[PDB]
Amino acid sequence: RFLKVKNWETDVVLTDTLHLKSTLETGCTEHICMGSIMLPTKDQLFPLAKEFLDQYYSSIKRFGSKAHMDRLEEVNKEIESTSTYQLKDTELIYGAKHAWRNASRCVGRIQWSKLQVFDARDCTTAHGMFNYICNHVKYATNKGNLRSAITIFPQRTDGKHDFRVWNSQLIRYAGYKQPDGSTLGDPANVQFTEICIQQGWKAPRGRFDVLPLLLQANGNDPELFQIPPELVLEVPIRHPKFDWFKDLGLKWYGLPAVSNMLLEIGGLEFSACPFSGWYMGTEIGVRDYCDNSRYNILEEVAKKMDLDMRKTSSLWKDQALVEINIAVLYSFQSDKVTIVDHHSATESFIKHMENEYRCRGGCPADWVWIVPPMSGSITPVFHQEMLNYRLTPSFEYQPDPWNTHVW
Amino acid sequence: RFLKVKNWETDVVLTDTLHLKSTLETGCTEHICMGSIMLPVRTKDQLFPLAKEFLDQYYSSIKRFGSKAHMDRLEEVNKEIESTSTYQLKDTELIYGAKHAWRNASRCVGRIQWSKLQVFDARDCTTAHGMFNYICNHVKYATNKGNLRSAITIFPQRTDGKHDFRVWNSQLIRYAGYKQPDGSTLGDPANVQFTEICIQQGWKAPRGRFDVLPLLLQANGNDPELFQIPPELVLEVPIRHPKFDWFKDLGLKWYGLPAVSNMLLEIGGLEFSACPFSGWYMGTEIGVRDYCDNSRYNILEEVAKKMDLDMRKTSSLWKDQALVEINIAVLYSFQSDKVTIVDHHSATESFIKHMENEYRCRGGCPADWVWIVPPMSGSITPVFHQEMLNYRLTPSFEYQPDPWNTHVWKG
Numbered sequence: 176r177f178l179k180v181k182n183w184e185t186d187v188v189l190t191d192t193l194h195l196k197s198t199l200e201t202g203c204t205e206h207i208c209m210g211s212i213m214l215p216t217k218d219q220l221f222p223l224a225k226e227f228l229d230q231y232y233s234s235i236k237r238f239g240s241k242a243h244m245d246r247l248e249e250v251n252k253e254i255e256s257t258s259t260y261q262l263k264d265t266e267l268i269y270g271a272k273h274a275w276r277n278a279s280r281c282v283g284r285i286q287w288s289k290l291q292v293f294d295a296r297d298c299t300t301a302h303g304m305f306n307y308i309c310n311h312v313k314y315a316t317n318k319g320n321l322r323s324a325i326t327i328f329p330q331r332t333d334g335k336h337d338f339r340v341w342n343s344q345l346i347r348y349a350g351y352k353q354p355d356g357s358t359l360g361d362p363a364n365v366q367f368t369e370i371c372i373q374q375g376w377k378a379p380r381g382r383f384d385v386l387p388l389l390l391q392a393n394g395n396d397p398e399l400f401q402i403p404p405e406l407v408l409e410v411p412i413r414h415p416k417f418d419w420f421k422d423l424g425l426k427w428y429g430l431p432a433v434s435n436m437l438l439e440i441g442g443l444e445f446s447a448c449p450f451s452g453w454y455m456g457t458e459i460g461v462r463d464y465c466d467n468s469r470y471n472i473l474e475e476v477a478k479k480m481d482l483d484m485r486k487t488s489s490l491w492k493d494q495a496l497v498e499i500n501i502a503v504l505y506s507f508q509s510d511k512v513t514i515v516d517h518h519s520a521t522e523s524f525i526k527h528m529e530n531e532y533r534c535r536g537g538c539p540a541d542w543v544w545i546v547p548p549m550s551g552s553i554t555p556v557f558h559q560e561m562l563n564y565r566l567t568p569s570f571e572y573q574p575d576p577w578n579t580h581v582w
Numbered sequence: 583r584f585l586k587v588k589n590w591e592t593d594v595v596l597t598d599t600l601h602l603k604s605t606l607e608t609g610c611t612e613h614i615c616m617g618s619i620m621l622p623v624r625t626k627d628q629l630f631p632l633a634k635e636f637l638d639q640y641y642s643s644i645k646r647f648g649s650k651a652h653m654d655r656l657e658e659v660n661k662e663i664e665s666t667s668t669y670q671l672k673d674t675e676l677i678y679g680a681k682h683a684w685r686n687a688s689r690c691v692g693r694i695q696w697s698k699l700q701v702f703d704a705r706d707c708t709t710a711h712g713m714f715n716y717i718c719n720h721v722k723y724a725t726n727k728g729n730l731r732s733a734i735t736i737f738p739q740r741t742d743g744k745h746d747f748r749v750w751n752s753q754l755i756r757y758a759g760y761k762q763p764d765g766s767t768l769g770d771p772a773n774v775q776f777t778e779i780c781i782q783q784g785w786k787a788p789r790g791r792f793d794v795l796p797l798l799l800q801a802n803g804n805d806p807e808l809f810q811i812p813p814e815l816v817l818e819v820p821i822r823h824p825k826f827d828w829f830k831d832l833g834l835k836w837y838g839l840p841a842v843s844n845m846l847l848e849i850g851g852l853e854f855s856a857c858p859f860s861g862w863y864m865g866t867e868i869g870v871r872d873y874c875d876n877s878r879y880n881i882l883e884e885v886a887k888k889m890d891l892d893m894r895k896t897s898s899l900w901k902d903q904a905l906v907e908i909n910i911a912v913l914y915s916f917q918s919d920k921v922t923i924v925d926h927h928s929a930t931e932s933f934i935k936h937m938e939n940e941y942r943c944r945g946g947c948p949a950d951w952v953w954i955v956p957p958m959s960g961s962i963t964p965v966f967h968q969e970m971l972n973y974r975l976t977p978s979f980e981y982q983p984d985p986w987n988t989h990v991w992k993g
């Protein structure tokens with residue numbers, strides 16, 4: 176019931192009680208651990224509302240006050256009559272910050288309380304959504320000095336009037352299947368790109384075409400919009416020592432901005448809630464560039480470095496990997512676009528865990544996602560035991576809309 | 583029930599039925615995942631079911647389930663339990679059991695090899711001197727002048743828990759660590775406590791950076807005794823780098839034989855508390871963990887100094903750069919001296935083939951992702967992208983408390 180986590184590098188032992196407040200289920204049982212699996216009414220709504228308002232009023236040191244009781248009464252009345260309820264602005268901001276705070280897969284949570292929340296609940300159309308999104312993008316980008324932001328569109332009603340951003344991230348590159356058999360651009364985006372073409376987009380058919388937004392308002396058919404190119408900050412990738420690196424013609428975008436998740440606050444569901452921060456270098460240099468099923472560039476780079484690609488044991492992959500990641504960080508730093516390296520981010524996350532343990536009694540964390548995809552054990556998170564559990568408010572996965580939407 | 587795992591790189595989906603045969607508990611619940619937690623005297627009543635389950639597995643494996651030989655063996659074991667409160671494994675069953683504990687070891691990436699394991703039966707051993715002799719022979723056999731062979735040596739099983747056989751070393755071959763009055767450590771900081779115990783027991787410590795520790799051996803619940811493995815039996819590799827000629831001048835070496843000696847082997851409810859086993863290294867175990875962990879030899883700074891990397895900010899990735907070079911040096915050095923070693927690319931690629939084969943032939947392969955994914959370059963190995971299911975099958979290798987914490991000293 177009281178649980179210990181140990182750091183094996185420093186011998187620091189922390190005690191977790193926060194897990195006892197966990198509500199949702201992990202996927203694991205006493206017989207089987209699913210830690211490495213990627214995706215493991217009026218009646219229902221009032222307990223959820225109560226649980227949330229209780230933590231909210233506790234958070235502002237007003238638990239059991241008349242203002243607390245009054246709101247609980249007000250929301251109860253609203254559900255009983257309308258079958259749903261509306262969050263106060265203060266509750267919305269609190270819930271959004273807390274969904275990030277509770278995101279057990281996020282290494283960047285030291286920043287959780289510094290989050291700009293844009294209330295787009297008054298939005299009614301896809302053009303409205305586009306306006307809101309451009310404003311988010313411009314605000315967050317801030318000419319390279321990135322600021323965390325979330326934009327919150329109207330909540331689920333009867334589930335037939337959902338707001339959705341069809342894109343997986345606000346900014347991503349198109350992927351195209353070639354007569355050749357291979358793939359031009361980002362292979363992850365092939366299907367979404369086809370949907371864009373199918374709905375009318377004119378693809379420029381290049382390696383790095385910023386996708387258009389496909390926005391769905393009020394459960395209507397989604398529409399296409401090109402983000403003003405001048406709001407999409409991109410970084411050409413060069414190496415501080417290798418002059419040939421630029422010849423690879425690599426670039427990435429500055430703003431990471433997840434648009435396909437569902438924000439759950441007090442039982443209310445916000446199916447369109449794009450949010451953004453700033454990159455950790457490895458996300459681009461390790462995953463986007465080096466995953467076999469992504470831009471998969473390790474072979475080309477290794478060749479340009481004239482490494483012995485005969486045997487895996489020359490560690491040519493590992494050598495090229497480091498250089499690619501040096502280039503990513505260098506290019507972002509040189510163009511003054513906020514980025515964090517994996518040493519710095521993991522060091523911050525350990526300090527954040529320690530703060531959360533002393534001030535909240537714990538910190539849910541998914542070791543499988545928190546440990547960076549390169550150089551695991553030379554980062555402090557590798558040696559840190561973590562307990563993974565699901566607290567609410569939360570960000571959740573949801574089915575891709577095209578599998579669900581009726582035209 | 584069926585459970586599916588997906589590889590996110592290849593889209594290969596596998597289906598696990600084997601998890602239905604799992605009995606032991608994980609540490610996890612529906613409400614909490616303990617997947618990153620390092621560590622999450624039996625009655626007759628509890629013993630016969632464990633024996634029965636094991637012997638049913640064994641007899642099925644040899645295609646003799648329900649045969650007369652099967653039934654007679656159950657009757658014979660049952661009778662032995664009721665009469666003596668325990669039982670003895672046949673040689674065939676011990677071999678099968680030891681191979682299966684390895685097959686079932688979900689934290690082991692090296693399991694493609696599980697069916698080639700030399701089993702040394704040391705259940706006739708009675709004294710610490712006897713244990714020393716067994717262990718010397720295992721080391722010599724396993725080492726095989728650099729052409730490493732997997733082996734396990736199995737000492738007598740637990741009886742009342744008061745007569746345990748224990749190897750006190752965590753690994754058969756390890757370097758001493760000494761804490762200096764100024765707070766610095768000479769040698770391996772992981773082995774300081776154990777080194778102090780050895781010194782107290784009368785070991786004459788040379789006090790260098792790579793002193794092979796003496797064996798500390800407990801037979802029959804008696805006080806343990808010290809023995810020096812003959813140096814000619816301890817194969818070592820000096821570490822050098824193929825391009826960096828200054829690398830040799832760091833003065834690094836490592837031993838060739840990784841041999842875990844502190845785990846408990848459970849077969850059919852019997853407990854083998856001394857069962858040292860050995861294989862061969864994956865390069866990262868030395869180049870990443872032993873050399874570069876902050877709490878181990880911690881060589882990253884000195885290596886990056888000598889490479890003249892920009893060390894003023896972490897974002898130059900100097901640590902990542904030095905890490906790859908050290909690991910190249912380890913593979914180069916072992917290969918040049920013809921001592922078996924496997925790189926983390928080859929090892930993980932082989933593990934995925936093993937895992938797929940295990941799914942086809944056995945209905946599953948329990949695997950602990952946290953441990954299987956190498957401690958450098960994780961996502962450029964295929965295991966990073968492989969979903970895995972972790973559960974506990976018997977026979978098994980288990981952790982056990984360190985014997986200095988529990989031993990009743992006789993004097």
Ligand code: HEM
Nearest residue numbers: 275278280281282283286323324450451452453454455570
């Ligand atoms: C400020 C800088 C931030 C950094 C450096 C950062 C870091 C990261 C990283 C490295 C990941 C793993 C992503 C992957 O491997 O695909 C991640 C995941 C995640 N982060 Fe952050 N984050 C930041 C801001 C945010 C913000 C502002 C939010 C929400 C308000 C957020 C919520 C999440 C969630 C829900 C995940 C899991 C995504 C998924 O499961 O696919 N993070 N974070």
Ligand code: HEM
Nearest residue numbers: 684687689690691692695732733859860861862863864979
């Ligand atoms: C033949 C070559 C082998 C290779 C390359 C190999 C590889 C590894 C590696 C890299 C680890 C993780 C070690 C760590 O990070 O501490 C490991 C763990 C383990 N292996 Fe192997 N292994 C081999 C043979 C064996 C053998 C012969 C056995 C027993 C018969 C075995 C059983 C285990 C067990 C029980 C663990 C978990 C140890 C723990 O929890 O501390 N392996 N293996």
Ligand SMILES: Cc1cc(N)nc(C[C@H]2CNC[C@H]2OCCNCC(F)(F)[C@H]2CCCCN2)c1
Nearest residue numbers: 213214283431432433450451452453454455458
């Ligand atoms: C807000 C924020 C800041 C930051 N630095 N980084 C992020 C993660 C973003 C960027 N870089 C990766 C992307 O994360 C996107 C979410 N990943 C999930 C997935 F893509 F793996 C899918 C694949 C198919 C089905 C299962 N899950 C967010």
Ligand SMILES: Cc1cc(N)nc(C[C@H]2CNC[C@H]2OCCNCC(F)(F)[C@H]2CCCCN2)c1
Nearest residue numbers: 620621840841842859860861862863864867981
């Ligand atoms: C048989 C075999 C072959 C191989 N390549 N590699 C091995 C693991 C050995 C070697 N290289 C590391 C060591 O593994 C020993 C087990 N390590 C775990 C530990 F020591 F950190 C403690 C911490 C506390 C909790 C319990 N375990 C075995």
Ligand SMILES: C[C@H](O)[C@H](O)[C@H]1CNc2nc(N)[nH]c(=O)c2N1
Nearest residue numbers: 211212213543544966967968969
């Ligand atoms: C199967 C496994 O869970 C999968 O490859 C995970 C591993 N760790 C990860 N970690 C992060 N941060 N992001 C990811 O997409 C993944 N993928």
Ligand SMILES: C[C@H](O)[C@H](O)[C@H]1CNc2nc(N)[nH]c(=O)c2N1
Nearest residue numbers: 557558559560618619620952953
């Ligand atoms: C806390 C965490 O589980 C611990 O550091 C683990 C992580 N993965 C590991 N993986 C291997 N192979 N060996 C280890 O010692 C560890 N340590």
Ligand SMILES: [Zn+2]
Nearest residue numbers: 203208610615
């Ligand atoms: Zn689990």
